[PDB]
Amino acid sequence: VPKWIQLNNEIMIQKDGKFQFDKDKEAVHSYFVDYINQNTVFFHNLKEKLDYLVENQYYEEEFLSLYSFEDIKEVFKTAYAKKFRFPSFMSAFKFYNDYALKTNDKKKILERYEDRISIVALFFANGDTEKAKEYVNLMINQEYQPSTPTFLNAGRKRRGELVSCFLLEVNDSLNDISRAIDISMQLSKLGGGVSLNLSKLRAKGEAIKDVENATKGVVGVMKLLDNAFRYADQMGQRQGSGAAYLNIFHRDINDFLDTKKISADEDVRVKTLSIGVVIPDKFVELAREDKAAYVFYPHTIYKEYGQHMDEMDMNEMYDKFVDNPRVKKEKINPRKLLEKLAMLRSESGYPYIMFQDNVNKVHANNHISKVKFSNLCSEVLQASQVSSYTDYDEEDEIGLDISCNLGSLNILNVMEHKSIEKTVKLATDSLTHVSETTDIRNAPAVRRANKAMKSIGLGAMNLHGYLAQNGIAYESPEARDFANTFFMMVNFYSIQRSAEIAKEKGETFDQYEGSTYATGEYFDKYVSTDFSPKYEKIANLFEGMHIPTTEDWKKLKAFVAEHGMYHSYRLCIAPTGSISYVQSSTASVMPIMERIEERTYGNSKTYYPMPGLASNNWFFYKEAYDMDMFKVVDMIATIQQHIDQGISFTLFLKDTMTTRDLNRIDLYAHHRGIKTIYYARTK
Amino acid sequence: VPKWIQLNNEIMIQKDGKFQFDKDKEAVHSYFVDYINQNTVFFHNLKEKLDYLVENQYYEEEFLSLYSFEDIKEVFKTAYAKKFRFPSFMSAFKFYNDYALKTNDKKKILERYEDRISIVALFFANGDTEKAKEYVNLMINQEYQPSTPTFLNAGRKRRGELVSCFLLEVNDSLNDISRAIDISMQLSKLGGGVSLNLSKLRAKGEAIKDVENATKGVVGVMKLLDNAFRYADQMGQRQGSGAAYLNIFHRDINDFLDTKKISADEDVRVKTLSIGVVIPDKFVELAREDKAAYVFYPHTIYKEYGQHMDEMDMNEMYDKFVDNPRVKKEKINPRKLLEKLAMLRSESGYPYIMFQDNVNKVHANNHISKVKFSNLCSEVLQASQVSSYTDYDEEDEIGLDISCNLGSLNILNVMEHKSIEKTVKLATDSLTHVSETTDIRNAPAVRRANKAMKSIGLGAMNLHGYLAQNGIAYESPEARDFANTFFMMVNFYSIQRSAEIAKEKGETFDQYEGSTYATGEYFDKYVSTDFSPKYEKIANLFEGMHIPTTEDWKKLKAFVAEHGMYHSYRLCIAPTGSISYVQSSTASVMPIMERIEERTYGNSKTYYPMPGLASNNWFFYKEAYDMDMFKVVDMIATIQQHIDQGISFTLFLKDTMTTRDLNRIDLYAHHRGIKTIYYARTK
Amino acid sequence: DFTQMFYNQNVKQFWLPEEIALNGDLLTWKYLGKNEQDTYMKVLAGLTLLDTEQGNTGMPIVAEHVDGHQRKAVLNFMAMMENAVHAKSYSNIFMTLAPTETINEVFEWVKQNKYLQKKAQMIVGLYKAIQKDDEISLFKAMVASVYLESFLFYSGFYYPLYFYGQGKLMQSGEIINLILRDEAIHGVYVGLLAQEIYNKQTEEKKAELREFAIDLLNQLYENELEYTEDLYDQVGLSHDVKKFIRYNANKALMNLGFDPYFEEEDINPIVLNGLKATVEPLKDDDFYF
Amino acid sequence: DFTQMFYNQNVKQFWLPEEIALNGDLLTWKYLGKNEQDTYMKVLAGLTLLDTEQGNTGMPIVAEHVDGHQRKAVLNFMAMMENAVHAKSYSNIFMTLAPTETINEVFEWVKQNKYLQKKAQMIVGLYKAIQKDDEISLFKAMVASVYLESFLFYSGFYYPLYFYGQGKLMQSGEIINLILRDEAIHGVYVGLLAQEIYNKQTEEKKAELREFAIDLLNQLYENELEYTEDLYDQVGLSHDVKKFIRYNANKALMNLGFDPYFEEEDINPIVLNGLKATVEPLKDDDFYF
Numbered sequence A, B: 001v002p003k004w005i006q007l008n009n010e011i012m013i014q015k016d017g018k019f020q021f022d023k024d025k026e027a028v029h030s031y032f033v034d035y036i037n038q039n040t041v042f043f044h045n046l047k048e049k050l051d052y053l054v055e056n057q058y059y060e061e062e063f064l065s066l067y068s069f070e071d072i073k074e075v076f077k078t079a080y081a082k083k084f085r086f087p088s089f090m091s092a093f094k095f096y097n098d099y100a101l102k103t104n105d106k107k108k109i110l111e112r113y114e115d116r117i118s119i120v121a122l123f124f125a126n127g128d129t130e131k132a133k134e135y136v137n138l139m140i141n142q143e144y145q146p147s148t149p150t151f152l153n154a155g156r157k158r159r160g161e162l163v164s165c166f167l168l169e170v171n172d173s174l175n176d177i178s179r180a181i182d183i184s185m186q187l188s189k190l191g192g193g194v195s196l197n198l199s200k201l202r203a204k205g206e207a208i209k210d211v212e213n214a215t216k217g218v219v220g221v222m223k224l225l226d227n228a229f230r231y232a233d234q235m236g237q238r239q240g241s242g243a244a245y246l247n248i249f250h251r252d253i254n255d256f257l258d259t260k261k262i263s264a265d266e267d268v269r270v271k272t273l274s275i276g277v278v279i280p281d282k283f284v285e286l287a288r289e290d291k292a293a294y295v296f297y298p299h300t301i302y303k304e305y306g307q308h309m310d311e312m313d314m315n316e317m318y319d320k321f322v323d324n325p326r327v328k329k330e331k332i333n334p335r336k337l338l339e340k341l342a343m344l345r346s347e348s349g350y351p352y353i354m355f356q357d358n359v360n361k362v363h364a365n366n367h368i369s370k371v372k373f374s375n376l377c378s379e380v381l382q383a384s385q386v387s388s389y390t391d392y393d394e395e396d397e398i399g400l401d402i403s404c405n406l407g408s409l410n411i412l413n414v415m416e417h418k419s420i421e422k423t424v425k426l427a428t429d430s431l432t433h434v435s436e437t438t439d440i441r442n443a444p445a446v447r448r449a450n451k452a453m454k455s456i457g458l459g460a461m462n463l464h465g466y467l468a469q470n471g472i473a474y475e476s477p478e479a480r481d482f483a484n485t486f487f488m489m490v491n492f493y494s495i496q497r498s499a500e501i502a503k504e505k506g507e508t509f510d511q512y513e514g515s516t517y518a519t520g521e522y523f524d525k526y527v528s529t530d531f532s533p534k535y536e537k538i539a540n541l542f543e544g545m546h547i548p549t550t551e552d553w554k555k556l557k558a559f560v561a562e563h564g565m566y567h568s569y570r571l572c573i574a575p576t577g578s579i580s581y582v583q584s585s586t587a588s589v590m591p592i593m594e595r596i597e598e599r600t601y602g603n604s605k606t607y608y609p610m611p612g613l614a615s616n617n618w619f620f621y622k623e624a625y626d627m628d629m630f631k632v633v634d635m636i637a638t639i640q641q642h643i644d645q646g647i648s649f650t651l652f653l654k655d656t657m658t659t660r661d662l663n664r665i666d667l668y669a670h671h672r673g674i675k676t677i678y679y680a681r682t683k
Numbered sequence C, D: 001d002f003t004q005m006f007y008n009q010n011v012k013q014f015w016l017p018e019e020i021a022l023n024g025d026l027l028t029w030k031y032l033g034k035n036e037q038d039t040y041m042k043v044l045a046g047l048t049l050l051d052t053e054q055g056n057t058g059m060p061i062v063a064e065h066v067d068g069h070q071r072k073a074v075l076n077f078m079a080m081m082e083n084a085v086h087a088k089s090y091s092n093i094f095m096t097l098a099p100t101e102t103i104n105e106v107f108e109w110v111k112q113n114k115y116l117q118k119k120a121q122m123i124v125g126l127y128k129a130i131q132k133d134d135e136i137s138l139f140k141a142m143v144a145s146v147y148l149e150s151f152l153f154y155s156g157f158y159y160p161l162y163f164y165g166q167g168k169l170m171q172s173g174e175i176i177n178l179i180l181r182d183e184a185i186h187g188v189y190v191g192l193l194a195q196e197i198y199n200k201q202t203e204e205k206k207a208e209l210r211e212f213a214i215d216l217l218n219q220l221y222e223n224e225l226e227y228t229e230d231l232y233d234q235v236g237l238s239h240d241v242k243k244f245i246r247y248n249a250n251k252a253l254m255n256l257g258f259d260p261y262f263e264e265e266d267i268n269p270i271v272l273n274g275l276k277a278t279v280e281p282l283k284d285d286d287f288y289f
């Protein structure tokens, strides 16, 4: 048993009726002094280390050649000038086991935390020494954390893509289905999660060019995609993860849901394919009034109207579809479908729930397209256009497939540094750089949408950690007040930075002129409502920091009208799974699942108290399962009103909660404006 | 019970110790006058019939527009002047259930046998009235039978392709694997059977861009292809049929064979994918000497030598691969592998066995490529060049993927009419037309190889029927003498027709000048050895029909050298499954399995005596299971020496014989020059 | 002289209802009258009850008291077939053809049906009366088991066979024929064990055992008549079924080594129409010819 | 929550002895030393004798006292596998490897063996102590059954798996692997039935049942150590066999919903190579807030 593992295990040994939280500092100190400093390759000078890394196929010479070695040396000086110390053993362990650069035999350590941060900053700045130093200060202060792909792979020769979330539209054709399988395998090969919209595919028992009842439906494509993701398993390193989305009004919705039942047949069940259900307001209205609903065969609708069923507004088109004799449908019970959804989420956590009209009532790019589905993590909500992949000899009609770049603000560190504006703008610049430097050669729609939309996702994390370390309960109205003010400021400065980038480059995103940013409809609630804190305690948290006012929002609206907006999408709150340990932060804006995290690595068990947990703030670190999910919905809806994309919203349920309770949580989320629901986690 | 199937069941009622074979004539007469003439749509004149069929999307207007209606009327008169009568109930039942045109609701019958034959003939002739009449005479006399795709779809609007056998080479890349899956689904959608070579794919545990043990092997691609063929099943009426081929020296050969074991897990076993094993003479030599053989990792060989393993000569490079330290190899026992092959064929009928050096020692187009795999029916043996499907933005290097049009001579009717030459030439013309009118716009390599190679497959059937109806035992030397003379004559006239077509069109097949036809080496055994029958009984069977001598073969060799050959491949003997009933013929050149064949169609049981079966030739219709497989191998090898492609050779095994007997049959087939072994059928 | 051949026959007859796809019966079922569907459901429910008790109780208890590991293996296999295969197959049929409420109702109907309760009471009572090392109580239970296998099932079997013979409900009918094929060999086997015990007795004791067997048969028969009328009067077939059960009663008696008790009658002809390779290593000489 | 799932897994694992040809084992059997052949014979007889108790008593007695038609069917299926499949398979292996006289002598020896008898009679004692309508006595017997299925067999399974992992006695090793795979699922299933009873008890009664289970495990474990040395010292394997016993004891405890008793240990690599919350409807007013 390692000495640091023993020291970390002494946290649970209760001395004087309290956990020994101070043992984790001893644990991390022992871990470093006994393992990391021993296994860290040291070089006489930074020049020798850099030469070894570039020449041994560890780094990329292209981005490092943009600086004189003096500038790189000063950047590394800035990283090491902070004397950053990992507060807990788990932070250092996670970094040096997941993100630190190791030798080709994975025996020694080439990169410390400072080296990784310096390389990421030098890649972000793209030749600017002052910008690189600013990125170094931002990341070594741990105010901004680039996503796991960006943080892990930036500046590495043998790297995967810096983007890991992709959203593909699948057209109703064998050519398009085969192309979707190919692109899914190519993107999973790069290490990215792939989400596929299956709503355009015609249902089971539909006609294929005069041969009726010949289509296997969305479940055959589901099996194809599941095997494609199983094959493209990231070189046998990490299991290939993909998601499939289907509209709740699709005829195959029940077959779509039956793929996740525990009793599912092996010719129906899918293993590596997550499922998400898209629910328009029409379905919730039908279930509310207990009227019997209809699911429609998409190809009949396409033949009758020339438009896909998911391309049309179900609120206005549902009655026309039902009254159309040439549109084929079967009766369903919407309440029974809702209960089936809740039962499936209780049993397996699936499907994801995307409230279509909650997303699109505040969507800023409805002119480009409505948001029809989400990503594998249920936070990316962007307009997509389906591609028409024709025969081999013909020319394909390339659409827009969603792929956004992820980054997370550390709410605790941004708040303690009083640097919401600077951190938000620098994170926007880094995400923009990642977007520009991303070129995917086997997903033409993804590449086209990356070049045109220039969409980024700037998330946040350590919300519960910041609140509990400041004596604020997560469910308290003061917590929602802080979230309101903080994310209003984040949105303000992200919009300002996007407009500044548009002014600097003289270009906006494609089809910006039709957006609500161009017409000013986006800024209505910001030029009409004041989002300053309503509590003196919360207003004191923002001391020394200018909270944007209504006049500031009017000035921003005028600036955006004059100069445009560079990013179609800017903010999305991803789960931030493994980077939260490195940042000593609670995951995303979700509340903590456990106060102290018990995990086993190898043959030794490890203990991870939540960051900042102590005796004084023990009960402010309320576990998510002990919380009222209605208040968590209230918090996420408070945040969601300032996030242009969605938020990964996990439901934390007790074992005593019934199907009716899960349905009530889902319906209250729909009522409160929640866009997506990620997971149903049961204790 | 239907009257016709009641009459057909009176065959088995033994009267005076004999089967009532004449009941089948009464059975078919009742079948017609009680079902067919009643359910047949009859029009006032042929003009109304043709207008009705063209207008209601049953026929194609383009091919019928090349003839004035007087010519079409003359063709239909020629078809009906024969007054063809089906000799058995099964013939008419199979035709009117599988190939006769029916109304859109599958209610009534639009085409008789004469109508279908006339339409196929007018399609073949392509505007020529006299040629259409010649084709009508050829098919109404049942001397030549177009394959099931051609006979079923010739001249129909809503039709599949006229070719159903496709062979695909898969390169060792994810782009090429995705393209292989796409092309397999596209061709299965067209109704064709697709065979894929998986030898170029690197084995399990190979590196994918310097990360080791990353490749899932050929079994992952096998699962992908199996699900692709399950998806593209054409309503499931005829589910997607695929074949995978692996060289026996591939490292994944044991896992490739384990996909067919009964005890295989659901994560390994493939169900819709047939498997074939390509065995070079090196493997048979290694097993014969009981030496230690080695299977190789294909990617190591490709990296070391720059060529794929299956693109190299194993009999000359096996020792170099073994001695090469940079080539990765695994030790195997070749005799244990042979025993495993025999056990797998006994328990499942798989794999197909291709003797690669038996195919390539007589292959005429080794300059283009060596034959590396066979088709799903294990009789197409043509040169293929792998394609290089690149990224979306890059141009693809299109290779040569095999596909040939099938057609069978009826040996009994051809020999009765003394029309080997005319039947062979007309069938060659029809197959050439089918090749010219085929355009696969989603399989680039299939299209390119169809345009370049112009390969056709002209098979034969009713060999056992003809021999049994002429008092010749299938195993007798006289039967092999007849097969030798008959198929030498077929080869002579097919080569003559190919040379005449090349002379008329002024073009040969691509890379003809490097072929053995151009060098004249192909004709060595024909200008040196006389193939006239050695028995007076057989020599009288060919009386009235000129048998080409050595002088005739020398003249043909000069003609080919001076004019070239239009088809790279001309003759392949396919199984000819369902068209054998319509033609009242035994299936292919293989011996019959049952003298009287009992089948259940729906809830009706009906019996099919072999064509011409009686008491005077009961024992000449010896079942395939009761005869020596060594003599059947001798017969197939006698036929194979005149066939440029392979012969679908089914092994008929008793329950008593062990795996050693199956291995002995396989080794004797390899010794006797058998190119492929199709099935190990056990009774 | 017989157990090994019964062992081999039983294991070679092994099957599962899932081997037979049932969706093909959907249309011929839809087309039956309400009376016909009602009788059919109830008939199969009565069969389900019999197999439930034969599997849970009858076969295991007889297995417990019969000596010899091979005899026990046969009886254990037969027990498994009763409840793991036969009784379950009926639910496969029900779940295909009928909505849940109709299924619930028919199982409630078995609980309250007086003839079905009486026959279960009588048969299971005899099973539970077996006393260890008491061959007479065992014989009595084996007679009861033969009467269940070879007589009592047949008022139920009639109807699926009657449809099968007309080309109706043929997938369900295929299942029923497999069940019937099993029960025929089960009745013979248990009959042979019963005869073993009977043959050990004095002539006086034998005379009493014949009285027991005939009295029991008559009592079961009279109850089965009322059950048959109750089920079949609404479909017009009661008299025909009665002839069938008498026919099978004679077969049960014969399985017990007794003379037929009922006179022969013509049965509905429709119902009559309702009825690795060895591995050998390669030698060196195998590679030369 | 689980019986239909186990039904499916059980019936899809169905197999017969005849499927594996045994004669080719003689080609490796002839090359083993006397001690290896002796240990193998003794281990095989040990497994055979214990499995017979499970077929004749263990499974049928549990099937008798457990309520539920579907559970009785699964339990019947498991009893069938013991008596009809496993017992014939062990006999087949013996008849292939030893002459009749040698088989009779090995069984005489193992029948008199102190360590085999101690465990066999301890298990059988608990089966004989089950009382009608007493779930505590049923639970104790289920614990005994799980200990046999998931723990006691494994000191025996070790040796065939050890050979199987080396390429020796592959045909009989394949048979043993199929048997072991059945016993694994039997142990898991009976374990779930025991947990059902355990969960119906008070906290004091639970603590008392835990003490029973641990005490029983301790008695059996100490006898297993002696059994192990008695058989495996002569072939030098006892240390590794002991690790395998503890690893399987932990699996047996986990089957009963209990914590592992023994520290985690690595196993011999040759042997390794051988080896719904509650549905509630939406009742309106849940759509309004």
Ligand SMILES: Cc1cn([C@H]2C[C@H](O)[C@@H](COP(=O)(O)OP(=O)(O)OP(=O)(O)O)O2)c(=O)[nH]c1=O
Pocket: A189, A231, A232, A233, A234, A235, B171, B172, B173, B174, B175, B177, B201, B202, B207, B208, B209, B210, B214, B215, B216, B217, B220
């Ligand atoms: C991407 C991928 C490839 N493979 C296998 C299948 C292909 O035959 C083989 C080649 O993959 P490639 O697509 O050629 O990968 P690569 O070009 O980046 O690697 P290399 O430089 O070695 O050519 O790898 C997998 O098994 N799983 C996977 O996820």
Ligand SMILES: Nc1nc2c(ncn2[C@H]2C[C@H](O)[C@@H](COP(=O)(O)OP(=O)(O)O)O2)c(=O)[nH]1
Pocket: A041, A042, A043, A044, A045, A046, A047, A049, A073, A076, A077, A078, A080, A115
């Ligand atoms: N010497 C050295 N410095 C390293 C290494 N990895 C990162 N660094 C950082 C530490 C300093 O901030 C910076 C410059 O180190 P140096 O080259 O020793 O500089 P100097 O102090 O000699 O001027 O590089 C490393 O491996 N060696």
Ligand SMILES: Nc1nc2c(ncn2[C@H]2C[C@H](O)[C@@H](COP(=O)(O)OP(=O)(O)O)O2)c(=O)[nH]1
Pocket: B041, B042, B043, B044, B045, B046, B047, B049, B073, B076, B077, B078, B080, B081, B115
């Ligand atoms: N009348 C008619 N003839 C048909 C039909 N299908 C095929 N035929 C064939 C039969 C004859 O050989 C040929 C000409 O038939 P027709 O048009 O009736 O001409 P004719 O009998 O007046 O010369 O067409 C058909 O449906 N009707």
Ligand SMILES: [Mg+2]
Pocket: A172, A173, A174
């Ligand atoms: Mg289309």
Ligand SMILES: [Mg+2]
Pocket: B172, B173, B174
């Ligand atoms: Mg490559």
Ligand SMILES: [Mn+2]
Pocket: C051, C054, C081, C082, C086, C087, C179, C182, C183
């Ligand atoms: Mn039964």
Ligand SMILES: [Mn+2]
Pocket: C054, C078, C082, C149, C182, C183, C186, C187
């Ligand atoms: Mn029975």
Ligand SMILES: [Mn+2]
Pocket: D051, D054, D081, D082, D086, D179, D183
């Ligand atoms: Mn057992």
Ligand SMILES: [Mn+2]
Pocket: D054, D082, D149, D182, D183, D186
């Ligand atoms: Mn067991």
